[PDB]
C-alpha cells in the first residue's frame, strides 16, 4: 500500500466532503432542490434530504462513509439537523486547508474549531433555553412542525401530524426521563393513503382482519388470545414441505386439520378470548372452523408482533396454545378493522387506551414517496418535537444564529493572542455558508444575504428576523417561523466540528489508494 500524508491525504480529506456537501447544500432545507437519484437498479429516488442523499450515496473515502453515518446520529437524535452538520463539516476543510496553507499546523487549526465550538453551542443556549409540557409545547411543536413538517415541503393541514407527534413523543420519550425513546412509537402506514389522512392510533393495528364477515367484526374489550399455535403451516426455522400424492392420501388431510382447529378454536374460545391472535395465524381452513365455533379471531401475525400485542396491550403473556388460561390474555380496547377512507390502507386496530405500551403513528400517502414524504417529514418533526418536548429550546435559524454566533467567536478570536483565533475566525467564518447556500437554494444573492442578517445582527444583536428560508419574501426567522430545537442546533456543531477534528488528527493514511470508503 501507501502511507499518504501531508497535503496528499489532506486533499483526500478535503476532496470527498465537497462532492458530498454540495448536493446536500443544493438540497439544503425547503429551498433545497429535490434530487432524483437513480440506482444501478434503475430506480428513481428524488432526494431533497441530505440524509436521504447520504442514505442514497456512499462516497468513496472513509469520512464520506462516516458523514452518511454522522447525520444519522442527529437524524436519530434530532431528526432535522441531517444536512447542515455535513455541508459545513467540509467547509471547515476549506477553512482549515487554507489555514494550513497559511502555514498553521493541522493540529493547531484542528483544535481551534472545537475550542471555538463552545460559543457555537453556547451562544445558541441564550436564545431559547425554555421548557414546556405536551399541551403547552403542542403550539410550539406545531409551530416547529410548521418548519419540520414543511422541511419535506409537507406541513399543510399537517398540524394533524404535528399534534399526533406531540402526544407520540411524550408517551414514548418522557419529558422527565430525558432519554431518547422512539422504540414504543410503532411506525405504521400504507401506500395509497393521503398526506391529509394521518392518524395516531394509541394501540396496535394488525394488518390481518376477521377470518369472516359472517363472524362479528367487533371483538369486545380485552379477551384477546395471545398465542403461538398453528392454524396454518407452522413455518419453523427449517423444515421441508412434502405434499400428498394419492387419492386415499388426500381425504384424511382435510379431516384432521378440521378436528384439531375446532378443539383449538373451541379451547381458545373456551379459554374465554374472543380474538385469537396466533403467532401462527389461520389458514383459510381454520377460518371456517373458527366460524363453526363462532369466535372472532386474527390470521397470520408476525412472530414478534404477538409480543407487540403483549407489550402494547398490557395483556399478560401466554406464549403458546398448550398453556391456555383465562387469566393471561391479550387486551384490546376495541377490535375494529379500520378503513381510513382509502381502503388501500386497511388495518384491524387492537386498541389501547388505559395501558398503551406502544403508541402507533399511522401515516398515509398516495405513493411510496408520499408516505415516505410524510414519514421522514413527521419523523424528523417527531425528533425535534421530542427534543422540544423534553426541553423546548429553539432559535431563529437559517443562518440568523450562524451570523450571531459568528460575531462572538470571530470577535473572541482576536481577544486571544492564541494561534486559534485564525481557527476561531475561520470557525466563525465557516458558520455562515448555511444562509449563503440557503440564499442560493432560495435563489438570492447569498453574499449580501448573510450580511443583511448581520446588518440586522448589528441592529438585532439576536436572530429573530432572518433572510428567506421559504422564498416567501418576508425576511424572518420569527414571523416566517424558522424555529427548531436549540438542542439539534447544538448537535450539528459538536458533531460537525468534533468529527472534522477526528478527521483532522488523522492525516495518517494507510490505504492502497488515497480515499477508501
Amino acid at each position: 500500500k501507501s502511507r499518504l500524508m501531508g497535503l496528499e491525504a489532506l486533499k483526500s480529506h478535503i476532496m470527498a466532503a465537497k462532492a458530498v456537501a454540495n448536493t446536500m447544500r443544493t438540497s439544503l432545507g425547503p429551498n433545497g432542490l429535490d434530487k432524483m437519484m437513480v440506482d444501478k437498479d434503475g430506480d428513481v429516488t428524488v432526494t431533497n434530504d441530505g440524509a436521504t442523499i447520504l442514505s442514497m450515496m456512499d462516497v468513496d473515502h472513509q469520512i464520506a462513509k462516516l458523514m452518511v453515518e454522522l447525520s444519522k446520529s442527529q437524524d436519530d437524535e434530532i431528526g432535522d439537523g441531517t444536512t447542515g452538520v455535513v455541508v459545513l463539516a467540509g467547509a471547515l476543510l476549506e477553512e482549515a486547508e487554507q489555514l494550513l496553507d497559511r502555514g498553521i499546523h493541522p493540529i493547531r487549526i484542528a483544535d481551534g474549531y472545537e475550542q471555538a465550538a463552545r460559543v457555537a453551542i453556547e451562544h445558541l443556549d441564550k436564545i431559547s433555553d425554555s421548557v414546556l409540557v405536551d399541551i403547552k409545547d403542542t403550539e410550539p411543536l406545531i409551530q416547529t412542525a410548521k418548519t419540520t413538517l414543511g422541511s419535506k415541503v409537507v406541513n399543510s393541514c399537517h398540524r394533524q401530524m404535528a399534534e399526533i407527534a406531540v402526544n407520540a413523543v411524550l408517551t414514548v420519550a418522557d419529558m422527565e426521563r430525558r432519554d431518547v425513546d422512539f422504540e414504543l412509537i410503532k411506525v405504521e402506514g400504507k401506500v395509497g393513503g393521503r398526506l391529509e389522512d394521518t392518524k395516531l392510533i394509541k394501540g396496535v393495528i394488525v394488518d390481518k382482519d376477521f377470518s369472516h364477515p359472517q363472524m362479528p367484526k367487533k371483538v369486545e374489550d380485552a379477551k384477546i388470545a395471545i398465542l403461538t399455535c398453528p392454524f396454518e403451516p407452522p413455518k419453523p426455522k427449517t423444515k421441508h414441505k412434502l405434499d400428498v400424492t394419492s387419492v386415499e392420501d388426500y381425504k384424511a388431510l382435510q379431516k384432521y386439520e378440521k378436528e384439531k382447529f375446532e378443539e383449538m378454536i373451541q379451547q381458545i374460545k373456551e379459554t374465554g378470548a374472543n380474538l385469537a391472535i396466533c403467532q401462527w395465524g389461520f389458514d383459510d381452513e381454520a377460518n371456517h372452523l373458527l366460524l363453526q365455533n363462532n369466535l372472532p379471531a386474527v390470521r397470520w401475525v408476525g412472530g414478534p408482533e404477538i409480543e407487540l400485542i403483549a407489550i402494547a396491550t398490557g395483556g399478560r403473556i401466554v406464549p403458546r396454545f398448550s398453556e391456555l388460561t383465562a387469566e393471561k390474555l391479550g387486551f384490546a380496547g376495541l377490535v375494529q378493522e379500520i378503513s381510513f377512507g382509502t381502503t388501500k390502507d386497511k388495518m384491524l386496530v387492537i386498541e389501547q387506551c388505559k395501558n398503551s405500551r406502544a403508541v402507533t403513528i399511522f401515516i398515509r400517502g398516495g405513493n411510496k414517496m408520499i408516505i415516505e414524504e410524510a414519514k421522514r417529514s413527521l419523523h424528523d418533526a417527531l425528533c425535534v418535537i421530542r427534543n422540544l418536548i423534553r426541553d423546548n429550546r429553539v432559535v431563529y435559524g437559517g443562518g440568523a444564529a450562524e451570523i450571531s454566533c459568528a460575531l462572538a467567536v470571530s470577535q473572541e478570536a482576536d481577544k486571544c493572542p492564541t494561534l486559534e483565533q485564525y481557527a476561531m475566525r475561520a470557525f466563525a467564518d465557516a458558520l455562515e455558508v448555511i444562509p449563503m447556500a440557503l440564499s442560493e437554494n432560495s435563489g438570492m444573492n447569498p453574499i449580501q444575504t448573510m450580511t443583511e442578517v448581520r446588518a440586522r445582527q448589528v441592529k438585532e444583536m439576536n436572530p429573530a428576523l432572518g433572510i428567506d428560508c421559504l422564498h416567501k419574501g418576508t425576511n424572518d426567522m420569527k414571523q416566517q417561523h424558522v424555529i427548531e430545537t436549540l438542542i439539534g442546533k447544538k448537535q450539528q456543531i459538536s458533531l460537525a466540528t468534533q468529527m472534522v477534528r477526528m478527521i483532522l488528527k488523522i492525516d495518517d493514511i494507510r490505504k492502497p489508494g488515497e480515499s477508501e470508503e
Binding site: 432542490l33 434530487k35 437519484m37 437513480v38 422564498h471
Partner: protein, 508 residues
C-alpha cells in the same frame, strides 16, 4: 455512490426528455407529420406512429429524466387523454425553455415558482379562454362532440372516429356525467368491415359450436357462471397419477377422457338447457355436453355477463357453484350468426340501454386498437366536458391566448421571474410552431400576430394547420374541454420543474 452533478444531470435532464419530446410533436398539431416507430431493437420492423406512448413506451426508457416524462405523460394520457404527446413535449419544451435561463443560471428557486405562477396564468388564461358550449344539452351533445372532435381527431380511424363521435356522446349523456365501457361494451373482432362498428344487442362471442349441439337455442334462461372447467376440474378423485413405466405414460392421457364426463353432471342438478361459463373446452368435450342435454356455452364475456346483468337485472358475482350464488339472466335468443367470414355465437333480445355492447370490426387489430383508446380519451374528457362544459379553442388558439395573458402577467408581476414566467409562455407557443412547419406554414408571421390577433380578441379564429391557415376553431370544431387542456398544463410543468429541482443524480 455514483453522483451525477449539477453540470451533467440537468443537461442530461435537459436532453433526454427533449430528445424524447421531439418525435411526438412532429405527429402533433393539425396535419402533424407522423413519426415512424422503427423497431430494429426487438424485431426488425417499421411502425407508423402518431401515438405518444407507442412512440414513447415501445421505447424502453433508460435516462432517469426520460423516465419521469414518459412516466408522467403516460398516466396523464390514461387519466386525461392524449397526455403522452402533450406533457412529454410541453415539459421538454419547458426544458428547452429552462436552458437559456440555466445558461443564465436563473435560480432553480426562481424558475419553479416563476413557472408555477405562469402555469396558473395559462391555466387561468385557458380558463379565461374557456367557455361552456354545454349550456344546452344538444349544445352539450355538440360540446361533447366538439370536445371529442378534438379528442377523436388526427387518428388512423375512419368510420370508428365517427361512430364514437355519437357513441361517446351517447354514452356520456345517458350516464349523466361519466363515460364508460360498462355503458358501451367494446368487442374488437375481425371482419370484412374495416372501420365499421355498431351498437350490439345482448352480446356476441367468437367461436363456433359444432358436433351434436344445435347452433341456436330458443327460450334461453342464462345460467351465469364465473366457474367452469379446464377440461380437468381439480377435486378429490381428480388427483390420480398412475405414471411410472412407459405403459402408464400411454394410459394416463386416456384417463382425461374419464375426467371430462363427470363434469357434465354438476350442471344437470341445475336443470337448464343454457349454461354459460367463463372457461373453455375442446371439440371432444363439445361431443360430451350436447349429448347429455345441458349445452355448454363456453368462455362467456366478462363484460357480456355484465352487459346482460345491467339490463336484464341480473347480478355479477364470483365463485359459481349452484345457480343461487350468481343471479340468473335471460336472453331472448341464443344463436350463432355469420359475420363476414367469421362464425360467431351471439346473445341478444336486450337492445342497448344502460349497458351497451360495441362490436368493432376491422381488417387488422390496428384499426381496432385506436377506436377503444380514442373513445377512452373521449369518454373521460367528455366526462370532463360534464364537469367543465368549457370548450376552449384547440389547435393553438387556446395555446396562443394563454402565453399572451401569461405575458402581461409575466411582465409586471415578476421583478425577476419574467425569466421563468415568459419562458413558460414561450413553450405554449412552441406547439403551434412544430405544427406550422408540419403544415408547411410559417410559425412566426402566424404565431406572434395570430396570438395577438386573437389575443386582441378573435377567439373563434385560430390556427387551422390542415390548410396551414389562420382559421376559425369554432366552425372547424377545433376546441376541447378546459379540463383535458388544464390537466396537460398541470403535469408537464412538473416533469420539467421536477428534474430542474434535480441538480444531482446519485447512482446506488
Amino acid at each position: 455512490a455514483d453522483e451525477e452533478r449539477a453540470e451533467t444531470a440537468r443537461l442530461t435532464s435537459f436532453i433526454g426528455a427533449i430528445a424524447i419530446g421531439d418525435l411526438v410533436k412532429s405527429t402533433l398539431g393539425p396535419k402533424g407529420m407522423d413519426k415512424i416507430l422503427l423497431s430494429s431493437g426487438r424485431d426488425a420492423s417499421l411502425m407508423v406512429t402518431n401515438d405518444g406512448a407507442t412512440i414513447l413506451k415501445n421505447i424502453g426508457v433508460d435516462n432517469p429524466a426520460a423516465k419521469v416524462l414518459v412516466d408522467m405523460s403516460r398516466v396523464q394520457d390514461d387519466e386525461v387523454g392524449d397526455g403522452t404527446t402533450s406533457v412529454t413535449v410541453l415539459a421538454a419544451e419547458l426544458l428547452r425553455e429552462a436552458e437559456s435561463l440555466i445558461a443564465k443560471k436563473i435560480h432553480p428557486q426562481t424558475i419553479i415558482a416563476g413557472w408555477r405562477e405562469a402555469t396558473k396564468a395559462a391555466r387561468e388564461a385557458l380558463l379565461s379562454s374557456a367557455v361552456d358550449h354545454g349550456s344546452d344539452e344538444v349544445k352539450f351533445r355538440q360540446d361533447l362532440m366538439n370536445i371529442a372532435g378534438t379528442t377523436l381527431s388526427s387518428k388512423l380511424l375512419t368510420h370508428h372516429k365517427d361512430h364514437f363521435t355519437k357513441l361517446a356522446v351517447e354514452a356520456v349523456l345517458r350516464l349523466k356525467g361519466s363515460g364508460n365501457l360498462e355503458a358501451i361494451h367494446i368487442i374488437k373482432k375481425l371482419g370484412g368491415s374495416l372501420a365499421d362498428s355498431y351498437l350490439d344487442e345482448g352480446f356476441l362471442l367468437d367461436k363456433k359450436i359444432g358436433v351434436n349441439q344445435p347452433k341456436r337455442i330458443e327460450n334461453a334462461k342464462i345460467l351465469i357462471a364465473n366457474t367452469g372447467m379446464d377440461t380437468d376440474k381439480i377435486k378429490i378423485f381428480g388427483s390420480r397419477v398412475r405414471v411410472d413405466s412407459t405403459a402408464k405414460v400411454a394410459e394416463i392421457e386416456h384417463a382425461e377422457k374419464e375426467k371430462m364426463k363427470e363434469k357434465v353432471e354438476r350442471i344437470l342438478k341445475h336443470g337448464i338447457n343454457c349454461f354459460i361459463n367463463r372457461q373453455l373446452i375442446y371439440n371432444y368435450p363439445e361431443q360430451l355436453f350436447g349429448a347429455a342435454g345441458v349445452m355448454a356455452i363456453e368462455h362467456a364475456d366478462f363484460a357480456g355477463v355484465e352487459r346482460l346483468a345491467l339490463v336484464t337485472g341480473g347480478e355479477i358475482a364470483s365463485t359459481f357453484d349452484h345457480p343461487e350464488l350468481v343471479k340468473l339472466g335471460s336472453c331472448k335468443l341464443i344463436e350463432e350468426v355469420m359475420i363476414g367470414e367469421d362464425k360467431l355465437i351471439h346473445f341478444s333480445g336486450v337492445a342497448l340501454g344502460e349497458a351497451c355492447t360495441i362490436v368493432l370490426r376491422g381488417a387488422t387489430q390496428q384499426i381496432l386498437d385506436e377506436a377503444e383508446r380514442s373513445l377512452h380519451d373521449a369518454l373521460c374528457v367528455l366526462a370532463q366536458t360534464v364537469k367543465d362544459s368549457r370548450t376552449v379553442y384547440g389547435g393553438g388558439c387556446s395555446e396562443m391566448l394563454m402565453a399572451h395573458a401569461v405575458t402581461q402577467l409575466a411582465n409586471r408581476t415578476p421583478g425577476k421571474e419574467a425569466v421563468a414566467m415568459e419562458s413558460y409562455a414561450k413553450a405554449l407557443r412552441m406547439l403551434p410552431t412544430i405544427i406550422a412547419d408540419n403544415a408547411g406554414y410559417d410559425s412566426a408571421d402566424l404565431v406572434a400576430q395570430l396570438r395577438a390577433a386573437h389575443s386582441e380578441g378573435n377567439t373563434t379564429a385560430g390556427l387551422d394547420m390542415r390548410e396551414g391557415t389562420i382559421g376559425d376553431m369554432a366552425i372547424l370544431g377545433i376546441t376541447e374541454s378546459f379540463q383535458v387542456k388544464r390537466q396537460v398544463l398541470l403535469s408537464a410543468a412538473e416533469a420539467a420543474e421536477v428534474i430542474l429541482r434535480v441538480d444531482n443524480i446519485i447512482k446506488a
